């Protein structure tokens, strides 16, 4: 077991609460890691922190060499029979779902030249593209052509209780992004301090597994 003494690498770890309160991890399981979403222009962004509900809408090109306008105008008439402020569909809707409300273990890690910075995460989120604009379209078309227990509608009204927040987007290149990177990178305590937490394994094992 003594063959572990010569080769010993040292790595320092820092933690900061500067950006811990304002931090949300977005997940995109539908998209391959090769492609990116920060390159496509974003028109709007919407959040409710009360229930950790994020609604995004992406802006795509209207008339590019890869576009069939015949289907586009048909879907436009279907949704028309307002959602879109143009003649065709140029926006995509992504809805979220709150996952692992008790997020204390998960923390983001940044590796600079020789130091590691770990920032606690507030919540982890999963972004998924929703298709509800066809639901309302078909429902309205059918409307035109034709004419104590805890349920789900109570929680729907509970969701409706809160107001909504609108957000601006900042992406690849911006002084703000580098500012936030420095604020999450800057440790402040550059000196090597000691006596922060002492807990022998005979105490940590007893704290982990309660005899009661």
């Amino acid at each position: 077991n003594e063959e572990d003494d010569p080769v010993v690498q040292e790595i320092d770890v820092y933690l900061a609460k500067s950006l811990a309160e304002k931090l949300y991890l977005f997940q995109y399981p539908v998209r391959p890691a090769s492609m990116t979403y920060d390159d496509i222009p974003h028109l709007s962004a919407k959040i409710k922190p009360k229930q950790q509900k994020v609604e995004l809408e992406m802006a795509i090109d209207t008339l590019n060499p890869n576009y069939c306008r015949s289907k586009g105008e048909q879907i436009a008439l279907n949704v028309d029979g307002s959602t879109y402020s143009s003649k065709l569909m140029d926006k995509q809707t992504f809805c979220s779902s709150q996952t692992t409300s008790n997020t204390s273990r998960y923390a983001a890690a940044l590796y600079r030249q020789g130091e590691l910075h770990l920032t606690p995460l507030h919540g982890i989120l999963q972004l998924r593209p929703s298709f509800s604009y066809l639901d309302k379209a078909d429902a309205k078309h059918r409307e035109r052509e034709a004419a104590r227990v805890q349920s789900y509608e109570f929680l729907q009204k509970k969701h409706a209780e809160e107001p909504w927040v609108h957000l601006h987007y900042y992406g690849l290149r911006d002084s703000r992004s580098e500012h936030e990177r420095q604020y999450l990178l800057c440790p402040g305590s550059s000196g090597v301090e000691n006596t922060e937490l002492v807990k022998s394994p005979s105490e940590y094992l007893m704290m982990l597994m309660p005899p009661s």
Partner: protein, 136 residues
């Protein structure tokens, strides 16, 4: 032709026209020799040793960690006395990015994108050494 029909089984290549696992020690070694700066998603054990539970929120700011790389072994985390082992799991193949949401007074807010994450590590305490110390 950037937008191409992606594949579910070959989501890693997704070639369609014209998997290798690595250890955390080697991974951090080649991440360091390139002198790059990327973000990592790490999972920590519940109820860390401290001063009831103790997470990073009920903790301090500064240097509270020490990583150790042993020859012909693994990567081993220390907080002075407690000993943990860290390793990689569920290598992600999809897109994962973290942004900073900023809330103003009522509605006006700034949302800035920081970066993406492409590696998930998990760290946990090895109960073997704990039992060896408690028994002896």
């Amino acid at each position: 032709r950037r937008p191409a029909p992606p594949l579910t089984p070959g989501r890693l290549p997704s070639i369609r026209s014209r998997p290798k696992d690595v250890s955390v020690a080697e991974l951090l070694r080649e991440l360091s020799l390139t002198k790059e700066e990327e973000l990592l998603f790490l999972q920590l054990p519940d109820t860390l040793p401290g001063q009831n539970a103790c997470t990073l929120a009920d903790l301090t700011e500064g240097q509270v960690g020490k990583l150790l790389i042993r020859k012909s072994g693994r990567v081993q985390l220390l907080l002075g006395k407690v000993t943990l082992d860290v390793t990689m799991g569920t290598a992600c193949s999809f897109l994962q990015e973290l942004v900073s949401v900023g809330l103003g007074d009522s509605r006006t807010g700034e949302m800035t994108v920081l970066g993406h994450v492409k590696h998930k590590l998990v760290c946990s305490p090895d109960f073997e050494s704990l039992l060896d110390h408690k028994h002896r």
